[PDB]
Design a protein around this ligand. Structure first.
Ligand SMILES: CCCCCCCCCCCCCCCCCC(=O)OC[C@H](CO[C@@H]1O[C@H](CO[C@H]2O[C@H](CO)[C@H](O)[C@H](O)[C@H]2O)[C@H](O)[C@H](O)[C@H]1O)OC(=O)CCCCCCCCCCCCCCCCC
Ligand code: CLA
Ligand code: CLA
Ligand code: CLA
Ligand code: CLA
Ligand code: CLA
Ligand code: CLA
Ligand SMILES: CCCCCCCCCCCCCCCC(=O)OC[C@H](CO[C@@H]1O[C@H](CS(=O)(=O)O)[C@@H](O)[C@H](O)[C@H]1O)OC(=O)CCCCCCCCCCCCCCC
Ligand code: KC1
Ligand SMILES: CC1=C(/C=C/C(C)=C/C=C/C(C)=C/C=C/C=C(C)/C=C/C=C(C)/C=C/C2=C(C)CCCC2(C)C)C(C)(C)CCC1
Ligand SMILES: CC1=C(/C=C/C(C)=C/C=C/C(C)=C/C=C/C=C(C)/C=C/C=C(C)/C=C/C2=C(C)CCCC2(C)C)C(C)(C)CCC1
Ligand SMILES: [Fe+2]
Lengths: 36, 53, 37, 98, 44, 416, 328, 31
């Protein structure tokens, strides 16, 4: 079904974009030895 | 052909040791000995203090 | 095979592949000579 | 803050739109867009990007020149209006309807 | 939808605008000399 | 000790020593060129003229016949001399590189940042590292352009898909359409369409190398003339170990890709010098058996696919996506045309498939290349994991261990 | 001045106060692993038989179709598919998708993405907690083995039907067919893997018995000795010098790994390297680089072949091979 | 009947795993 393909595509792209933009959100700073 | 004795072997072989473990834990909770985050016994029959008071 | 003017260089060719790998063992014996500083 | 962005936005949008007008005037839009190989368009897009970011990048920080930029800003506003309609006149009429 | 690229473009836009909103109040304009950037402007 | 690294991790002492790092890198490059030249010298010394290249364990000579050096029509090897001069040139360049690396490592300027500010660098100076990356990107684009010069102007490239059995053909119309070229990159990696591996002709090859050379050149001047943006500066780790880890991830990806490439693709690796692929050999067996059965005087040797494709039956049906230069003349619109099978089967295709039957104790050079570069790609991914973790932890500052005075976990509230 | 929604989302995702750490790698790990888990459970309980061979003879793998937990499996994809991408939307019907082994492809791909993201998540939590990041390198060995058994061997053989079935008896069938076709037992990398697994069990039992032997007395009589250790204590819970003296006197005068750092490095390194090598052996045997062939290695003066143990092993391999090659 | 028993056993195992994860004994650090 095309609708199932659309839903799976948008779910996959949603989680991949969550991963990608999350690692771009200053990830090396999120560590306990952060210099204030 | 459903093996009649095999059903009891699976059921009673699972129920009886599960019952024994559950009964042992519940009476252990009543005595305050069902946690490993407590000190060793201060006296015979007296459980040690818990780590968080 | 090898060209005619360089056919006398046949025996040296067979040991040509083993020179890169023996450089790795040269690093181990160099450290063993200095006592693994 | 928004005015600083809008100021450089208007002059540079105009400046690109000027050179587009002189291109279609000396060549006599969408016809050249398709006739040109896409390697050339990628070649053009590349050299603009290096220019816009490195060699012609704005650093964030006399009566003749102050009027000349106002002339440039005014002529940029006209060149911007013409270009977006010029493609549409190629889109529908095919040729600039004189 | 139809060409399957709008699903790609549309979703990374929506999460992209959320990321851009977070990026707006980040004082990352100044360049640092370090192995990693420890500056993260947490509003709350 | 002084740096804390033991002897078994002694090359880690060269991280902040740029002069000796340059010496070590140039010496390793000299070793690489030495192996290249010595291996092609070894292969030409043991080369038997009557046997094919894949029957005598040759991996470097087939890389030269693909470039159109010393190869005749049909894949025949004519002259060994071009391979010999390639080997001699690589030997001499290796001697030069080894001398330069030994000099820079031993008696060269140690920590050359002060003496040569153009060559000196700091790992955190993002402008300098982007400049170095841009220069080397320009060199890589120049190398791709050198391959295009070989393909389109100097001699040519061996086209295995040429009519009659393949020939060295000079390509004059490269596929410059970015839709096809980048649809190869954006192609799915599964069966049927095999991502970049599915390149089936010389035109897309030389056109894609034109596009890659142009992209590498413009990216090189871009990285030379610019600096990383704020998002890139806040995302990455700016240290030598981090750059090594990124390179390790990229090199691992490329190693796995080349392993699958030499396993499946028969265009950049023709079956005349590297031998047939696995699917190629299986369909060769099926095709030669069908030729015998047809010469004896639907058939069980073929089957009708659900997509209307006439393909070989049996266990060979899983390789129905195989394309070979000796099947395509007999393959029409719906696949294996029955009319084309027994009408115009040329005798050069008959011997080639019979030759590929026996090369189904023997290990093909495709198998050696695939297995070796796969091993290297996987272990380079492992090295990427190691160096990426160590770079991130050393940048943050706890690569030496957990500080006893301020343990981070003790300051967090309990999980439950 | 209010915090953006993305800031709160990033704070919650990378929070170390969650019961299970999520992280950015977990943003890929949790939906993929929960997809493969539910799909595996459904396909294991109820799924119609899969025609794996491609010749209209299906193999039953679900509980509802007459097999138990041992013989139950998610049968690999059909031989007609090969290495073709077969999602649920590219099949004409759900019945045809289940007939061709689509659940195998779905579960395997989601599981592979999930375990790679699990490696990344282990690194991520090691980074947020301020510890050294090489547990993920240790987990990279079973992940490599799973990749070689589920993805890479089908790539080399050209069909996902040759992948390992997601079941117990299917795993045994994969092992027997692999031995018949490649002689993995005589492969040096499988020998390194068996050495790694056997040695890992040896070293685990050895280290555990050495520590358990030298526990310092802290509890009363017949009370469990595990109460002698306090969670978060600083002092050592066992006598290291006594265990070292025992291990030294056990084999030869000075053999104890006196430094516990290199002892634990050796413990972490030996089975990981062994599993790495057996994974690479399985992956290289996908491209027909088989194990050692010592067939007909001993002949008499007149040329007659004197068998060895390798010949008996070859006879077993030949029996499995002729029973597997169904009308080759 | 047998498949029902197999399903019950597997689901019960997963329930035990769920309880062992989320209703575990909370680790307390000794003071
Ligand atoms: C990228 C995403 C990777 C995931 C892909 C896994 C499946 C890849 C596949 O089915 O693999 C096969 C494809 C190759 O595609 C093949 O490509 C072939 C192309 O050949 C065609 O074209 C050739 C042109 O000469 C010949 O003519 C040939 O006869 C003709 O058929 C055919 O299309 C085949 O059907 C098609 O399978 O690989 C690919 O596309 C590229 C493979 C990428 C490298 C392998 C991935 C890395 C390994 C997984 C990670 C393991 C990591 C372990 C650590 C954890
Ligand atoms: C281009 C690739 C590259 C580069 C430049 C580096 C660079 C570095 N690494 Mg990294 N690494 C890589 C790839 C790389 N590595 C890969 C692919 C892996 C996965 C195996 C690793 C895993 C790794 C670890 C686990 C460690 C390093 C460490 C180091 C540092 C010291 C290395 C050293 O002193 O060598 C010494 C070299 C040896 C002792 C050689 C050992 C013998 C090898 C394994 C033989 C291999 C067999 C060979 C192919 C055939 C030989 C057969 C026979 C002749 C014996 C140095 C900064 C060390 C450091 O402390 O961190 C910064 C460290 O602990 N690396
Ligand atoms: C690709 C291999 C390679 C290369 C190029 C290097 C490079 C280097 N290493 Mg590493 N190393 C390696 C592999 C390598 N290493 C391996 C496998 C190990 C594990 C055993 C090490 C362990 C190690 C340690 C423990 C140390 C180094 C150090 C160094 C640096 C100084 C070496 C020195 O002082 O030599 C002196 C050598 C001699 C006096 C004897 C050798 C003389 C020459 C070089 C022998 C070869 C001659 C050659 C054939 C001549 C051809 C010339 C002709 C072509 C014209 C140098 C940049 C040091 C460092 O990091 O910084 C100072 C250091 O402390 N290395
Ligand atoms: C990846 C690069 C590569 C590839 C694909 C090949 C492929 C081939 N070579 Mg060549 N070669 C290479 C690099 C390569 N070689 C290098 C670096 C050297 C220098 C040592 C040589 C020297 C060489 C010679 C002298 C000859 C070949 C020949 C051959 C052929 C037969 C090989 C054979 O007999 O198996 C032997 C199989 C083995 C030795 C298996 C053991 C492999 C090491 C296993 C150890 C595992 C791993 C490295 C451990 C790493 C540690 C880990 C922690 C990372 C085959 C086509 C022969 C021929 O047919 O062509 C003329 C031939 O005479 N090779
Ligand atoms: C990656 C290649 C590379 C790089 C970046 C360098 C870097 C450098 N070299 Mg080395 N070297 C190399 C490879 C390299 N070398 C090779 C292949 C050889 C063999 C010919 C040498 C042998 C060598 C010698 C004999 C000398 C250098 C010198 C220099 C320095 C001055 C070069 C210059 O003024 O250029 C100018 C370019 C732009 C301004 C510079 C730091 C000099 C030196 O190190 O200091 C005195 C010098 O005398 N090199
Ligand atoms: C060897 C390949 C290579 C490497 C290591 C880099 C390195 C980098 N690039 Mg460059 N790039 C390349 C090839 C490369 N580039 C090519 C061939 C082009 C031409 C299309 C570019 C054009 C390019 C742009 C337009 C940008 C980068 C950016 C970046 C940075 C972030 C990349 C990322 O996060 O994804 C990083 C420093 C970003 C950066 O911030 O600018 C330097 C960015 O915006 N690159
Ligand atoms: C033991 C180390 C070792 C050895 C011996 C080899 C050996 C080989 N590899 Mg492998 N490699 C290794 C380690 C090794 N590799 C590791 C650890 C990785 C990362 C995992 C790789 C990644 C890798 C890839 C990705 C590929 C190879 C390939 C190859 C083969 C060809 C190499 C080549 O042509 O490069 C040459 C590269 C250069 C940069 C040299 C300069 C190139 C410019 C040449 C221009 C020529 C031009 C036409 C001249 C025109 C002149 C005219 C105009 C006048 C060769 C058998 C290739 C192969 O065929 O498939 C497996 C391939 O695609 N390797
Ligand atoms: C196989 C099926 C049959 C067996 C059934 C097995 C159960 C599978 C059900 C799948 C869903 C699982 C729900 C429980 C997970 C959860 O909610 O955690 C709640 C916690 C904290 O909750 C939050 O915690 C907050 C308090 S604090 O943050 O901890 O301080 C609190 O404010 C907030 O209310 C609360 O939401 O959140 C997390 O840890 C993230 C959970 C990620 C979800 C994936 C679950 C993985 C499955 C677990 C293993 C199953 C075996
Ligand atoms: C200032 C310079 C200028 C002149 C002098 C001019 C002239 C004409 N325009 Mg144009 N045009 C723009 C600029 C100019 N137009 C701009 C900025 C836009 C984008 C908003 C634009 C868009 C359209 C569209 C969609 C259509 C269009 C047309 C005509 C046509 C009317 C016929 C008439 O006068 O009776 C005459 C020649 C119609 C057409 O093409 O023929 C029917 C038509 O459908 N225009
Ligand atoms: C620093 C260091 C190092 C390194 C170094 C290196 C690695 C080096 C390299 C080196 C090199 C890399 C070398 C090269 C050389 C070469 C040569 C020396 C050449 C020669 C040639 C010839 C002699 C030839 C001849 C011929 C001909 C022409 C023809 C045919 C025949 C023949 C072949 C004979 C080491 C680690 C060790 C140690 C530590 C320190
Ligand atoms: C030669 C040739 C060719 C080719 C060409 C081309 C066109 C290419 C391209 C290529 C390309 C175009 C590539 C690309 C790539 C990309 C990549 C590889 C990416 C990656 C990424 C990354 C790495 C990132 C990451 C991240 C994230 C995601 C998040 C945040 C963090 C980070 C940043 C880390 C062809 C095939 C046609 C044909 C044959 C020949
Ligand atoms: Fe321990």
């Amino acid at each position: 079904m095309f609708t199932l393909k659309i839903l799976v595509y948008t779910v996959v792209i949603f989680f991949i974009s969550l991963f990608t933009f999350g690692f771009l959100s200053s990830d090396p700073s999120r560590n306990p030895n952060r210099k204030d | 052909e459903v093996s009649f004795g095999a059903f009891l072997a699976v059921i009673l072989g699972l129920f009886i040791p599960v019952v024994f473990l559950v009964t042992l834990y519940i009476q252990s909770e009543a005595q305050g000995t069902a946690t490993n985050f407590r000190l060793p016994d201060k006296a015979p029959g007296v459980p040690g203090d818990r780590y968080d008071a | 095979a090898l060209p005619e003017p360089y056919t006398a260089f046949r025996p040296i060719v067979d040991v040509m592949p083993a020179i890169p790998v023996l450089f790795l063992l040269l690093a181990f014996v160099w450290q063993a000579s200095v006592g693994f500083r | 803050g928004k005015y600083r962005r809008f100021q450089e936005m208007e002059i540079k949008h105009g400046r690109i739109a000027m050179l587009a007008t002189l291109h279609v005037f000396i060549t006599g839009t969408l016809a050249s867009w398709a006739a040109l190989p896409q390697a050339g368009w990628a070649q053009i897009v590349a050299v603009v990007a290096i220019l816009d970011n490195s060699l012609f990048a704005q650093d964030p920080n006399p009566k003749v020149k102050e009027y000349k930029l106002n002339i440039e800003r005014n002529n940029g506003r006209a060149a911007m209006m013409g270009i977006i309609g010029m493609m549409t006149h190629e889109y529908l009429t095919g040729n600039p309807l004189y | 939808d139809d060409s399957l690229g709008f699903v790609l473009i549309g979703v990374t836009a929506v999460i992209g605008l959320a990321w851009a909103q977070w990026q707006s109040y980040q004082d990352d304009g100044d360049d640092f000399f370090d192995t990693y950037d420890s500056r993260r402007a947490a509003a709350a | 000790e002084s740096t804390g690294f033991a002897w078994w991790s002694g090359n880690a002492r060269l991280i902040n020593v740029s002069g000796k790092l340059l010496g070590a890198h140039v010496a390793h490059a000299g070793l690489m060129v030495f192996w290249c030249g010595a291996m092609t010298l070894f292969e030409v010394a043991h080369y038997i003229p009557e046997k094919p290249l894949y029957e005598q364990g040759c991996i470097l000579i087939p890389h030269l016949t693909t470039l159109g050096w010393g190869v005749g029509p049909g894949g025949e090897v004519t002259d060994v001399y071009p391979f010999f001069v390639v080997g001699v040139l690589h030997l001499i360049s290796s001697a030069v590189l080894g001398f330069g690396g030994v000099y820079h490592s031993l008696i060269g300027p140690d920590t050359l940042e002060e003496s040569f500010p153009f060559f000196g660098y700091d790992w955190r100076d993002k402008n300098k590292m982007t400049t170095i990356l841009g220069i080397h990107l320009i060199l890589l684009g120049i190398g791709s352009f050198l391959l295009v010069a070989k393909a389109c102007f100097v001699g040519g490239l061996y086209d295995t898909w040429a009519p009659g059995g393949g020939d060295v053909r000079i390509v004059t119309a490269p596929t410059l359409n970015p839709l096809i070229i980048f649809g190869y990159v954006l192609k799915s990696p599964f069966g049927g369409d095999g991502w970049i591996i599915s390149v089936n002709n010389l035109e897309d090859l030389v056109g894609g190398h034109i596009w890659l050379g142009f992209l590498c050149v413009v990216g090189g001047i871009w990285h030379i003339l610019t600096k990383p943006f704020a998002w890139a500066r806040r995302t990455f780790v700016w240290s030598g170990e981090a750059y090594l880890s990124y390179s390790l991830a990229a090199l691992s990806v490329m190693g796995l890709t080349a392993s699958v490439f030499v396993w499946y693709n028969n265009t950049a690796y023709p079956s005349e010098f590297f031998g047939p692929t696995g699917p190629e050999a299986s369909q060769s067996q099926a095709f030669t058996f069908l030729v015998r059965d047809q010469r004896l005087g639907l058939g069980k040797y073929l089957m009708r696919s659900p997509s209307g494709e006439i393909i070989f039956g049996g266990e060979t049906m899983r390789f129905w996506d195989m394309r070979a230069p000796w099947v395509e003349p007999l393959r029409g619109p719906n696949g294996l045309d029955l009319n084309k099978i027994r009408n115009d089967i040329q005798p050069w295709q008959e011997r080639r498939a019979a030759e590929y039957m026996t090369h189904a104790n023997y290990v093909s050079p495709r198998s050696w290349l695939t297995t070796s570069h796969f091993f290297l790609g996987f272990f380079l991914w492992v090295g990427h994991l190691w160096h990426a973790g160590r770079a991130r932890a050393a940048a943050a500052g706890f690569e030496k261990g957990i500080n006893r005075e301020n343990e981070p976990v003790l300051s967090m509230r309990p999980l439950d | 001045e209010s915090a953006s929604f993305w800031e709160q989302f990033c704070a919650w995702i990378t929070s170390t106060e969650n019961r299970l750490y999520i992280g950015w790698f977990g943003c890929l790990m949790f939906p993929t692993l929960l997809t493969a888990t539910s799909a595996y459970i459904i396909a294991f309980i109820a799924a119609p038989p899969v025609d794996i061979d491609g010749i209209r003879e299906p193999v039953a793998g679900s509980l509802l179709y007459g097999n138990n937990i041992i013989s139950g499996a998610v049968v690999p994809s059909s031989n007609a598919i090969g290495v073709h991408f077969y999602p649920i939307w590219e099949a004409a019907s759900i019945d045809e998708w289940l007939y061709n082994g689509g659940p195998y492809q779905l579960v395997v791909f989601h599981f592979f993405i999930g375990v790679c993201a699990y490696i990344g998540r282990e690194w991520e939590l090691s980074y947020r907690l301020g510890m050294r990041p090489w547990i993920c390198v240790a987990f990279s060995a079973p992940v490599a083995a799973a990749a070689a058994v589920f993805v890479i061997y089908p790539i080399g053989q050209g069909s996902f039907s040759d992948g390992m079935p997601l079941g117990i008896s299917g795993t045994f069938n994969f092992m027997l067919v692999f031995q018949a076709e490649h002689n993995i037992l005589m492969h040096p990398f499988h020998m390194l893997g068996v050495a790694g697994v056997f040695g890992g069990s040896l070293f685990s039992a050895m280290h555990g018995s050495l520590v358990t032997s030298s526990l310092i007395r802290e509890t009363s009589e017949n009370e469990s000795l595990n109460y002698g250790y306090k969670f978060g204590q600083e002092e050592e819970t066992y006598n290291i010098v006594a265990a070292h003296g025992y291990f030294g006197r056990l084999i030869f005068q000075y053999a104890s790994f006196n430094n516990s750092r290199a002892l634990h490095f050796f413990l972490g390194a030996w089975p990981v390297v062994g599993i790495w090598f057996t994974a690479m052996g399985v992956a290289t045997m996908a491209f027909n680089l088989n194990g050692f062939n010592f067939n007909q290695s001993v002949v008499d003066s007149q040329g007659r072949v004197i068998n060895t143990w390798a010949d008996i092993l070859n006879r077993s391999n030949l029996g499995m091979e002729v029973m597997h090659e169904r009308n080759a | 009947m047998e498949a029902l028993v197999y399903t019950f056993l597997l689901i019960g195992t997963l329930i035990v795993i769920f309880f062992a994860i989320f209703f575990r004994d909370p680790p307390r650090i000794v003071k």
